[PDB]
Amino acid sequence: MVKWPEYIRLQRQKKILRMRLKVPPAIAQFQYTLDKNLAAQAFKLLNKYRPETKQEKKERLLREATAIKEVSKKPYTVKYGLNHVVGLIENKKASLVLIANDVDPIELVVFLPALCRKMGIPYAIIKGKARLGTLVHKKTAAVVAITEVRSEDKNELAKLISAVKEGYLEKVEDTRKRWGGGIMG
Amino acid sequence: FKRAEKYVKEYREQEREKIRLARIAKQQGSFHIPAEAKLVFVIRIKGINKIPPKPRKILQLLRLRQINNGVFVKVTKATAEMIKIVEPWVAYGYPNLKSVRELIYKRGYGKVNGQRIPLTDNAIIEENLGKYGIICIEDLIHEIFTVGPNFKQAANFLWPFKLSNPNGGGNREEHINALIRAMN
């Protein structure tokens, strides 16, 4: 019959291979992702705490420059970058960690759920590194973290943390240890 | 499929409208406006999906159901109370001469025998009304602007206006002109 292109066949066969092999638990834990509602709540908070784009940064710096020509507190933003976020988790500064599920060299993030479990930081696996990228004005973002916030929504952050630790961490608690996949049947 | 947050949001809007209706019904309906009768254009905007019975009755008495409908309304005590009831859905204020003139010259239609025709001829409007003193379109223009006894029949004659949806263009007294300017 008709012939499919080669890279499309590679994509679909990589699908079937990654879903129907006996996957180790460290990799099989990434198939369990946040629901729609909890991801929406988390992204509402993280959209409240987005960083500034280049245009806003230059605009603000021009404003301070002309104010000097003619007082501030510490800025609170979503923290990103893999090594930076790992350093924040290790020093117990991060409060909530959101890890993308489609990092192509998956070794860069396999130790991250275990690390968050060890240091005690609440974590959740989200659908899409491109979603985390839009939040930080980049194309993609392997992981984001929130450490501290402004006063007016601290309670909200706390509730969100409790939400994931009641809504994602205990639904993952038993299946985070088990091998995934298989063709038994 | 409809989610629970929609249900709770709906209920919160309905409850807030219920207390607001009780507040306006209990309090004596006197606006901070002189007792002289005025004229205001009223254009209703999308807001709350579910309409309480008294607001939908007032909107039906003021014939505003379809998308982006506008009607001129007198200002006396009863009409002030009526428009204060339906404040969150309508936007009102004093129009200008060029506003009503352009608005009726671009979009002026008539209702007779339960059907809606465009204003095509002055003979059509003279066959439609006949004998109350109106003789042309400029006649009902200055009948709308300058006050007179022939408001009710002329307002019942005119279909209300289906203004085109804008692309980005409380109470105010003069910004309504820019609104209908961008609404047309």
Binding site: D35, K36 | F1, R3
Partner: peptide, 22 residues
């Protein structure tokens, strides 16, 4: 009867969890 109720409940659960759009 029971199968229709189970299918409707599963469809509603999928709409609640994974959403409706796409």
């Amino acid at each position: 009867s029971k199968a229709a109720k189970g299918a409707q409940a599963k469809k509603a659960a999928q709409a609640a969890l994974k959403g409706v759009h796409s």
